[PDB]
Design a protein around this ligand. Structure first.
Ligand code: CL
Ligand code: CL
Ligand code: CL
Ligand code: CL
Ligand code: K
Ligand code: K
Ligand code: NA
Ligand code: NA
Ligand code: NA
Ligand code: NA
Lengths: 91, 95, 91, 95
């Protein structure tokens, strides 16, 4: 499914960008920069916030650039992950 | 039982929440009830007041979120249309 | 619109139940109990958590009982709030 | 401009975010940038690490959430289908 494949690529690239930004601008460990990027775009939310104005502006834009992509990917992923169980419970 | 997709989504949600309860209690040292609370608020995107402390917990939670949100919200949508909406309509009928 | 009216009633009653529960079981001021109930069911999320096991169990169930209702109401409210602006920008 | 609903949702979102920035900076004492950040993460349901301290702020935020989420996510959906999705498709064309 190229639709799923493209959504995966777009999501990974968006999370990489966030990991680079927050690890370099906000001084987070890579794993913490990735964690912050993930909980932000999935809307789970973080227990910290950017300390720099640059980081605050980036996060606002990052949310609007990425929230729709991330939930499109979550939805397509959910279809692929659950379908084997549905098919085994049907055919 | 009538909706097989709903039954699959229910069981997978239950299994997902069990897995999180075991994980956070073992790896992050939470009481089982607090591990379950964390799993639920995380996968509903409510979010908790706490966060994972270990790198293992952080990596797991990222994967848990991406696989978990889709299944929990699939279950929630099915619960709304298959159980809650018919119950409300039934309870609005004059008798 | 009775559909909007029913969703409003259901939402208000659900938030009242939460306000009573968290103000009595978790010892919160009414406004804080309401605030907790709102940010939970809208998935904005709280910076606190229930301290009692009873309150933790209630919150888990409260989320599953109320999240679908609350977003149905948010959606119907959004249609009613934006439609005057759309109609003024059309007719 | 082509989608009039999209234009309405854009302007209302901008006005909503301006209102929150003014409110939280005045009533909760936040810097304007921090007030805007709070408004955005609140209305996208991401959530912040902080919360309103005053009863006025708590009451406003409840009303802001219910009116705001619907408009911001309406704008986000329109932005996805009208701007981002066509841009991605265009950028996938071999040339
Ligand atoms: Cl790291
Ligand atoms: Cl326990
Ligand atoms: Cl009060
Ligand atoms: Cl500022
Ligand atoms: K949240
Ligand atoms: K959320
Ligand atoms: Na949160
Ligand atoms: Na939070
Ligand atoms: Na959400
Ligand atoms: Na927090």
């Amino acid at each position: 499914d190229k639709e799923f494949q493209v959504l995966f690529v777009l999501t990974i690239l968006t999370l990489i960008s966030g990991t680079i930004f927050y690890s370099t601008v906000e001084g987070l460990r890579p794993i913490d920069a990735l964690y912050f990027s993930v909980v932000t775009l999935t809307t789970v939310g973080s227990d910290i916030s950017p300390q720099t104005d640059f980081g605050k502006i980036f996060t606002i834009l990052y949310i609007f650039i990425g929230i729709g992509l991330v939930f499109g990917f979550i939805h397509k992923l959910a279809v692929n992950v659950q379908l084997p169980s549905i098919l085994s419970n049907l055919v």
